Amino acid sequence: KPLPALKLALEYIVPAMNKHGICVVDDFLGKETGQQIGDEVRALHDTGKFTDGQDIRGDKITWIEGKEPGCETIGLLMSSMDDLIRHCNGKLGSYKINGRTKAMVACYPGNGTGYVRHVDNPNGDGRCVTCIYYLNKDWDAKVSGGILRIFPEGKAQFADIEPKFDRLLFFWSDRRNPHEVQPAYATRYAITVWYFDADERAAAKVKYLT
């Protein structure tokens, strides 16, 4: 009953991303797996593993590789994301996607926290696609806010993305999609991975010193 990943990628994600630069897949993993991911994320939060995401942003974050004890289902989510990008078979724009970040697990801990309008990759750092999975059971922005508002370039209207349970979102990471997280009034969780274009990443426009 769920669309197979290969068909989902080729028949929907590829055409939607090339047409709109934004693509939402609802009901990505199903209730049982979405809930397990929630349990794993709440466990990370409750045992104090998050740090300040940073005013520009009021989220708390941690990075997950996917093999850590207690993170097996998050690892399943990450491999499911990777499978979708592989099935896209180079058809997302002209990018040569060969890598990605670890998963960024993020919490906006209610109390009106959010993220001011920003571009993920404004300086050519190689990130081409942002992939976010939301895991907020019964989230309703009418009560709890927390909408992701995207302002796609060339378009007059904005795109509001509620951080709905089991919702997968893709969007170009570059200046085409400035976006903001509106104030959140309940605990809002999301997991993001960014995918890299091989060539842009190799141009080393950003040097990280330590």
Binding site: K1, P2, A16, D26, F28
Partner: peptide, 13 residues
């Protein structure tokens, strides 16, 4: 199983 192509949302199920 229906994508309204002027939109950017689809349910997988």
């Amino acid at each position: 199983x229906v994508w309204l192509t002027d939109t950017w949302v689809l349910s997988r199920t």
